[PDB]
Design a protein around this ligand. Structure first.
Ligand code: NA
Lengths: 67, 66, 65, 68
DNA sequence: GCGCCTCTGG
DNA sequence: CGCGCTCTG
């Protein structure tokens, strides 16, 4: 579908924005109304940015284990 | 410790108060010339970065199927 | 409800949000035809609203100047 | 050289003319890591028109609070 | 929440 | 954290 859950309250969602698709990695929350709303912590990537994130996982995992 | 993914977009692996942070963030340039982290960004713990990679295929399936 | 239009799609609201607040906000249209409030707003308690009212004269001078 | 009017602990009413458009902004401020006072997300900028209609509605707004 | 300053700060 | 598609202490 649209949503792919990565944290207890964080999802990476795919969405078509007028032909241009955005890969949005965002944290969510709920208002006093009980409905789920998005938050400030997040970012929407284009496909190229998403492609360049995947080919950087090499150094990402390496940098994580070096500290 | 930073890995670029966009024009002003970088993935920084850092240590903030004992725990490791994986920050996907967009930066901005000051008038003096240096870059500062901006509002658009999120920092994942190793556990959230864990399932992000596991869901990569599902995500790539969806970006094509749209 | 007790809505008070001030602009094109901007209203002021007197609400008892669980506290009495005078909220100035911009609103938008929903695909379901309804009208929803945006995040381009601010809620003022009666204290700040009174202070706001005591300085309109000073602000009206500034806009004229 | 003085165009701001305090209404709260960190809330102010500022006025200016950004490229001919005159705005009367009511919002809350914050402090950045550079030690400077910056406007915040809680607020709204009004044109003189919306500023006039706000004043012409203060009557009913004041007694709507009293009814609550 | 998702061109350009009299702007942009995890 | 001002000038097409989301509330408030
Ligand atoms: Na920020």
């Amino acid at each position: 579908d649209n949503m792919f859950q990565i944290g207890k309250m964080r999802y990476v969602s795919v969405r078509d924005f007028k032909g241009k698709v955005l890969i949005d990695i965002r944290e969510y929350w709920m208002d006093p109304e009980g409905e789920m709303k998005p938050g400030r912590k997040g970012i929407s990537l284009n496909p190229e940015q998403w492609s360049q994130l995947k080919e950087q996982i090499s150094d990402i995992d390496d940098a994580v284990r070096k500290l």
